[PDB]
Amino acid sequence: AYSTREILLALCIRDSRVHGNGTLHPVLELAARETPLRLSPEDTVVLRYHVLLEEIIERNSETFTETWNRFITHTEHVDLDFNSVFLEIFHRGDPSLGRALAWMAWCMHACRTLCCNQSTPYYVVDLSVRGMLEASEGLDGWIHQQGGWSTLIEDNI
Amino acid sequence: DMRPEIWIAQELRRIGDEFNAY
Ligand SMILES: [Br-]
Ligand SMILES: [Br-]
Ligand SMILES: [Br-]
Ligand SMILES: [Br-]
Ligand SMILES: [Br-]
Ligand SMILES: [Br-]
Ligand SMILES: [Br-]
Ligand SMILES: [Br-]
Ligand SMILES: [Br-]
Numbered sequence: 001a002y003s004t005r006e007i008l009l010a011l012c013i014r015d016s017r018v019h020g021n022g023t024l025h026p027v028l029e030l031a032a033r034e035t036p037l038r039l040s041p042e043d044t045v046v047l048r049y050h051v052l053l054e055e056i057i058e059r060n061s062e063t064f065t066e067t068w069n070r071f072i073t074h075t076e077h078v079d080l081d082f083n084s085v086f087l088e089i090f091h092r093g094d095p096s097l098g099r100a101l102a103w104m105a106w107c108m109h110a111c112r113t114l115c116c117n118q119s120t121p122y123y124v125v126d127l128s129v130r131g132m133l134e135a136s137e138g139l140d141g142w143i144h145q146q147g148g149w150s151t152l153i154e155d156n157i
Numbered sequence: 158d159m160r161p162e163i164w165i166a167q168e169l170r171r172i173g174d175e176f177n178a179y
Contacts, residue, residue, distance in 0.1 A: 063172070089169050106165075
C-alpha cells in the first residue's frame, strides 16, 4: 500500500544519500513533507529497487543522458512536460514491469543529475521533482493490480 | 516542440520491452 509517488521519492532520497555529500536538496525535503512520505529510504524494498534502477541506468547510460539533456533544454514548463512523456509510455499498449522500471529509472537519473549540478537553478530542480512525482501517480492502478511494489520485487523480479 | 518528449517515450518503451526479457 505504498504509492508510486512514495516509492519514487524514497528512491530519489536514497540515491541522494549515496551520491556526493549525501545531503538532500531542499526540494526533496519539501516533497517528503507534502506527499507525505511514509516509506523509509533505508527500507529494504527501497534498497532493492535502487539496485535494479541503477542497473537500468548503467545499461542505458548514454540514452538516459541524451534523453534527459534533450528534455530539460527544450522544455518551457518542466512539470507539465513530465506528464506527456509518462502518457506516451503507458497508454501506448498495456503497462509492463519493464516499462514501469524504465520510467522510474529515468526519473531517478533525472533527479540525480539535477541535484548533483550545483549550478542548477532551484526552480528547475523543484518543478522536475514535482513533475516526476505527480506524473508517476498514473502507475498506481496498474501496480496495485500486481499486488503492489513490495510484491513485485520480493516475488517477480 | 513536443517532439523531444515523443522520442524520449519511444526510447523508454524500447528499454522497458528489452527488460521484459531480462
Ligand atoms: Br526513515
Ligand atoms: Br535495461
Ligand atoms: Br551511468
Ligand atoms: Br520551467
Ligand atoms: Br540537469
Ligand atoms: Br537550493
Ligand atoms: Br530559482
Ligand atoms: Br524477499
Ligand atoms: Br510514437
